Amino acid sequence: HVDLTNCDREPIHIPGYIQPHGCLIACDNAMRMVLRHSENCGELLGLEGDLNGRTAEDVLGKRLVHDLRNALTVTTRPAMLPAMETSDGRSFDISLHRYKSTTIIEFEPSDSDTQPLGTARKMVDRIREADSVESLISRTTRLVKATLGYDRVLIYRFEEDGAGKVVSEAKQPELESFLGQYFPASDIPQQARALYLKNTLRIISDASGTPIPVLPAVDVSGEPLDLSYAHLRNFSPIHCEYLRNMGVAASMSISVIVDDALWGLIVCHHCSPRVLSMPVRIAAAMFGEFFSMFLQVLKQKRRLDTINHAHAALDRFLRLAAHRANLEELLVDSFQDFARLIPCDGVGLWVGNNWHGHGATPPHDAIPRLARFVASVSEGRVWATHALSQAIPEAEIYADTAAGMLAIPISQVKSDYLLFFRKEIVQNLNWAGNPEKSYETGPMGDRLTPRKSFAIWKESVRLQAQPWSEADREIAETARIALVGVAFHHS
Amino acid sequence: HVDLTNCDREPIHIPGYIQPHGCLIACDNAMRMVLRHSENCGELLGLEGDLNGRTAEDVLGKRLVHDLRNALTVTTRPAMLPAMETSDGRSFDISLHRYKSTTIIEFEPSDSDTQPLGTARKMVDRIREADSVESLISRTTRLVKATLGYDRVLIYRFEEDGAGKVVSEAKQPELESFLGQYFPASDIPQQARALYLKNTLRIISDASGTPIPVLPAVDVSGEPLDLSYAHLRNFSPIHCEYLRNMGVAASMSISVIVDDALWGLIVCHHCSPRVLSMPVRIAAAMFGEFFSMFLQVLKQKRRLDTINHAHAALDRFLRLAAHRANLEELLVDSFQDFARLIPCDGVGLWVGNNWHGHGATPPHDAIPRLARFVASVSEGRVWATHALSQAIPEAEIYADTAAGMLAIPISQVKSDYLLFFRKEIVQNLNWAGNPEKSYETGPMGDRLTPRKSFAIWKESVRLQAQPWSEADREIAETARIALVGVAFHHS
Numbered sequence: 001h002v003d004l005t006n007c008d009r010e011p012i013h014i015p016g017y018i019q020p021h022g023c024l025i026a027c028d029n030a031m032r033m034v035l036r037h038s039e040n041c042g043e044l045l046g047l048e049g050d051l052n053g054r055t056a057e058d059v060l061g062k063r064l065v066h067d068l069r070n071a072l073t074v075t076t077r078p079a080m081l082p083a084m085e086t087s088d089g090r091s092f093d094i095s096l097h098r099y100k101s102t103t104i105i106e107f108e109p110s111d112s113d114t115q116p117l118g119t120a121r122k123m124v125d126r127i128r129e130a131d132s133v134e135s136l137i138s139r140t141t142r143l144v145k146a147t148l149g150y151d152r153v154l155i156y157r158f159e160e161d162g163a164g165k166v167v168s169e170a171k172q173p174e175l176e177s178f179l180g181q182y183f184p185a186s187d188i189p190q191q192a193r194a195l196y197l198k199n200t201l202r203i204i205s206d207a208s209g210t211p212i213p214v215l216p217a218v219d220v221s222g223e224p225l226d227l228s229y230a231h232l233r234n235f236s237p238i239h240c241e242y243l244r245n246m247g248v249a250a251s252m253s254i255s256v257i258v259d260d261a262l263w264g265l266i267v268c269h270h271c272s273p274r275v276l277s278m279p280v281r282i283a284a285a286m287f288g289e290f291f292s293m294f295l296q297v298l299k300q301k302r303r304l305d306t307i308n309h310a311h312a313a314l315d316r317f318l319r320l321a322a323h324r325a326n327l328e329e330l331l332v333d334s335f336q337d338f339a340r341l342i343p344c345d346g347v348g349l350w351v352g353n354n355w356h357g358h359g360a361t362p363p364h365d366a367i368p369r370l371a372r373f374v375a376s377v378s379e380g381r382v383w384a385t386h387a388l389s390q391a392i393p394e395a396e397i398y399a400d401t402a403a404g405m406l407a408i409p410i411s412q413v414k415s416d417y418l419l420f421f422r423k424e425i426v427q428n429l430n431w432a433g434n435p436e437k438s439y440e441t442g443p444m445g446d447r448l449t450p451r452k453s454f455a456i457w458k459e460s461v462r463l464q465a466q467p468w469s470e471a472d473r474e475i476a477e478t479a480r481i482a483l484v485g486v487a488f489h490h491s
Numbered sequence: 492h493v494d495l496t497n498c499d500r501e502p503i504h505i506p507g508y509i510q511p512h513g514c515l516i517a518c519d520n521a522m523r524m525v526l527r528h529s530e531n532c533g534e535l536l537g538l539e540g541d542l543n544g545r546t547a548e549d550v551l552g553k554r555l556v557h558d559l560r561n562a563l564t565v566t567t568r569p570a571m572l573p574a575m576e577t578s579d580g581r582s583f584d585i586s587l588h589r590y591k592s593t594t595i596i597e598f599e600p601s602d603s604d605t606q607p608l609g610t611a612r613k614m615v616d617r618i619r620e621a622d623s624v625e626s627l628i629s630r631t632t633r634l635v636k637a638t639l640g641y642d643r644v645l646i647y648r649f650e651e652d653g654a655g656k657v658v659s660e661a662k663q664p665e666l667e668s669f670l671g672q673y674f675p676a677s678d679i680p681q682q683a684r685a686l687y688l689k690n691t692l693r694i695i696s697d698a699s700g701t702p703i704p705v706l707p708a709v710d711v712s713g714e715p716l717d718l719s720y721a722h723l724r725n726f727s728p729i730h731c732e733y734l735r736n737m738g739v740a741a742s743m744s745i746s747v748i749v750d751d752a753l754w755g756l757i758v759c760h761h762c763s764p765r766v767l768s769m770p771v772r773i774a775a776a777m778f779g780e781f782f783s784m785f786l787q788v789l790k791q792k793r794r795l796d797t798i799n800h801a802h803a804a805l806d807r808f809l810r811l812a813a814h815r816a817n818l819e820e821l822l823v824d825s826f827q828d829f830a831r832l833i834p835c836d837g838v839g840l841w842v843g844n845n846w847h848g849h850g851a852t853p854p855h856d857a858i859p860r861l862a863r864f865v866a867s868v869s870e871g872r873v874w875a876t877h878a879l880s881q882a883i884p885e886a887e888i889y890a891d892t893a894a895g896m897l898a899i900p901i902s903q904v905k906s907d908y909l910l911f912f913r914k915e916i917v918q919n920l921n922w923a924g925n926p927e928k929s930y931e932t933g934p935m936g937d938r939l940t941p942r943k944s945f946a947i948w949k950e951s952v953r954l955q956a957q958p959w960s961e962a963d964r965e966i967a968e969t970a971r972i973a974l975v976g977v978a979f980h981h982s
């Protein structure tokens with residue numbers, strides 16, 4: 001049994017079922033004896049009786065086994081063997097991998113139509129010239145939808161706290177939009193994120209399809225079959241009910257890997273059953289790999305441009321500070337300009353126990369309390385929180401205006417601070433979805449609906465701002481050194 | 492006892508001795524009763540008999556204790572209290588800190604001459620306009636020598652493996668040069684590096700001075716006095732013998748902290764005894780803090796310029812690759828130009844089982860072996876080692892030419908590689924010292940001499956190149972994506 005209480009620990013890598021669009025044969029390390037097989041091995045390959053115990057050269061035929069063994073030699077990265085001939089002449093696309101000293105063989109009815117390199121080259125050319133992260137993500141959903149013909153294509157970006165944001169969408173006009181919507185970290189368990197990091201590609205042919213059991217589900221020694229790298233691996237019934245509640249019949253997700261971390265997913269949804277042939281899956285995987293590499297470079301360039309711009313801005317200020325006698329007057333005139341360095345909804349100057357504010361800041365009378373707190377915990381270093389009420393309970397009163405704070409000391413001797421503020425994240429939502437869009441539910445309840453996922457997320461981020469990035473804190477530290485530096489020069 | 496076998500684990504934070512240029516009094520948490528005192532507390536403060544057991548208000552006087560307690564309130568960061576008046580009118584500079592719920596009070600005969608902020612401002616102004624790491628380090632030794640009047644000023648930079656390099660030097664003409672010399676990691680133990688990370692400043696007044704014991708060395712409960720933050724803490728007899736063998740009578744080291752790590756030391760050596768007054772030590776600490784902050788920014792700018800230049804170079808190449816029909820010919824014509832991206836002593840192209848070399852590369856007949864090894868372990872990612880002979884024993888034969896290798900895959904399908912090489916580090920030495928310079932030794936032996944330190948280091952780095960930096964590998968990865976990317980475009 002699995003319900004909304006234990007699905008966080010569901011062992012989705014050992015379900016003991018495959019999807020019905022193919023058949024699976026498990027063999028020993030050196031592919032000699034057949035240890036396990038899918039019930040539907042009969043229907044597809046046309047073999048009567050039990051396959052377990054019988055030898056590899058017997059069940060498939062000496063011809064094919066020679067080719068499979070030779071390919072295995074050339075690593076848990078599965079080997080693709082498209083359009084292979086069996087004993088009785090039937091044609092199959094074969095996926096072959098070795099994991100936990102068990103050899104797994106997956107059979108699909110052959111396609112042998114579309115060329116895998118040809119499709120991929122066309123798609124990769126149309127994204128290689130993107131000059132921004134925004135330009136790459138926007139065009140990719142549109143492109144994938146047009147090429148693989150899925151009803152909806154989304155990109156999810158994973159936030160610092162594991163939550164997912166829908167950052168791009170291409171869909172049929174009649175479907176509802178999820179663009180700018182968030183889902184909580186719990187909507188994709190840790191063990192699911194582990195498998196998504198191990199498999200570039202993940203297929204669901206039919207959410208309402210009947211799953212085929214693996215025989216035996218557990219062997220003599222009491223071990224289950226690990227289908228971690230098997231493309232036919234069946235899907236959690238919790239996620240199954242989710243897709244059915246949405247009217248999604250089929251899916252295909254591509255893993256976006258950046259700096260060896262799971263950045264997010266390209267996710268294709270279809271409203272009717274749909275399986276891509278092996279050749280099309282090879283092309284989509286190759287596209288996924290290139291999409292990942294290009295985004296990584298664009299992120300690097302973006303971070304780099306941002307730091308360059310901060311260095312330039314700080315030089316401009318240091319050149320001004322040389323020709324102004326009174327530094328305090330310059331800071332009072334200039335402080336608002338520092339909002340160009342770090343994304344913020346407001347900025348403020350606390351100098352000589354006087355307060356100057358710009359944009360969304362806490363109220364005037366709240367500032368002396370904050371200044372005392374900052375001086376207490378700062379210790380002449382940059383201090384930042386995205387949850388000010390967790391540090392100062394009375395800061396909850398003004399969370400809608402300032403939920404997040406980053407503090408920069410501007411003096412080595414006196415307790416003067418440049419303060420950057422952010423509104424609570426729910427205030428900055430640019431969500432575009434039908435708020436009165438209902439979802440039919442199943443046994444588990446209305447928890448498995450986009451509407452309730454979004455509601456749970458919104459609750460989780462109450463009184464919290466967008467977290468300060470590594471790039472934000474790196475710029476804050478360079479600004480601290482510039483300001484402390486020039487403050488020292490001016491006696 | 493401590494000898495060259497156990498000095499790696501010497502507990503230098505609890506030596507139970509202070510230096511003779513001041514006296515120490517240990518008190519309880521809330522400075523009520525005197526728990527420990529230095530033997531020389533008598534000579535300096537003019538008090539007869541044992542001080543332990545007697546109350547704080549008694550030994551020092553109710554007047555002074557009020558000021559010390561009040562200052563303690565305003566953190567293991569020691570409080571400076573220059574020119575303080577005792578009971579009988581004597582004048583003392585007082586260092587005051589609280590560590591492990593013990594209050595430690597250090598007394599020096601007062602100076603009250605030089606102004607601490609005035610000296611520091613002058614010094615910091617002369618380094619704030621440095622536009623390169625090289626310009627900052629070079630001018631700092633020269634400046635510190637001229638201002639604090641030490642016979643020799645060195646900067647040591649810590650390598651990845653913990654070894655120290657002398658990267659800058661200002662000295663009296665008659666002294667020998669250590670510029671470009673290395674010392675092994677063992678020459679500064681882990682527990683010493685821990686204290687250098689905790690104390691900005693470290694003084695040795697007289698290496699041949701007589702150490703004053705702390706009474707008691709161990710208390711009732713069996714605890715020693717932790718002098719981690721005490722400026723009078725006595726120095727290891729192993730390091731003492733080292734300085735005497737060099738003809739160094741006094742020292743003062745400043746900790747260079749960059750990204751919260753111990754980057755290195757500014758180290759002042761004097762050939763005669765020398766103690767700086769508290770006011771001069773405050774100024775030197777302040778200079779150290781600013782030197783650290785400026786170097787950190789200059790390192791950031793340098794890393795940033797290097798990555799910018801690589802991006803520019805790769806754009807120039809990608810623009811060329813569009814107008815050339817045959818990519819292989821372009822790579823054969825161009826490969827040597829990629830040596831501008833990553834510091835290397837040679838570079839080579841392995842394409843279609845053909846080899847093209849530039850600069851210091853392994854011999855022609857050795858390359859097919861390397862190409863096979865790289866293809867084996869690479870797995871389509873950047874692979875790098877600074878010790879090629881550790882991975883391929885026969886690579887020892889040509890270590891003088893190529894001890895380090897970084898491999899970049901330039902194809903997704905075929906096993907083609909761009910190879911960058913570095914000579915073994917001893918080949919790239921620009922050392923400027925008298926090789927026939929003898930050192931008088933003590934009980935421990937000739938291990939405690941710069942000559943033997945350098946010899947031990949040279950042995951430790953045999954058959955090894957300068958390690959590939961984080962910036963080197965970041966550029967290699969961006970080059971892999973550029974080259975794999977454009978290789979795919981060209982069918």
Ligand SMILES: *C/C=C1/C(=C/C2=NC(=C\c3[nH]c(/C=C4/NC(=O)C(C=C)=C4C)c(C)c3CCC(=O)O)/C(CCC(=O)O)=C2C)NC(=O)C1C
Pocket residue numbers: 004007008010012156178183186187188189192202234235236238239242251253267447448449450453454
């Ligand atoms: C209690 C456990 C739950 C759970 C587990 C799993 N989710 C899995 C896949 C998956 N979940 C989501 C989440 C979405 N949330 C939305 O609001 C939404 C659409 C608007 C989606 C799609 C996503 C995005 C995915 C990835 C695939 C996809 O279709 O997008 C899985 C793994 C499935 C598998 O292939 O093995 C598990 C397990 N999901 C829950 O909602 C809960 C409560």
Ligand SMILES: *C/C=C1/C(=C/C2=NC(=C\c3[nH]c(/C=C4/NC(=O)C(C=C)=C4C)c(C)c3CCC(=O)O)/C(CCC(=O)O)=C2C)NC(=O)C1C
Pocket residue numbers: 495498499501503647669674677678679680683693725726727729730733742744758938939940941944945
């Ligand atoms: C077995 C332990 C040893 C050891 C321990 C310690 N070294 C310490 C300080 C220290 N060592 C060096 C090394 C140098 N090597 C040189 O070749 C050289 C000059 C040419 C030097 C100076 C340095 C640089 C330092 C820092 C101070 C300095 O004077 O530069 C200490 C800590 C001393 C203290 O203040 O507590 C310990 C302990 N040193 C050895 O050589 C060995 C074998």
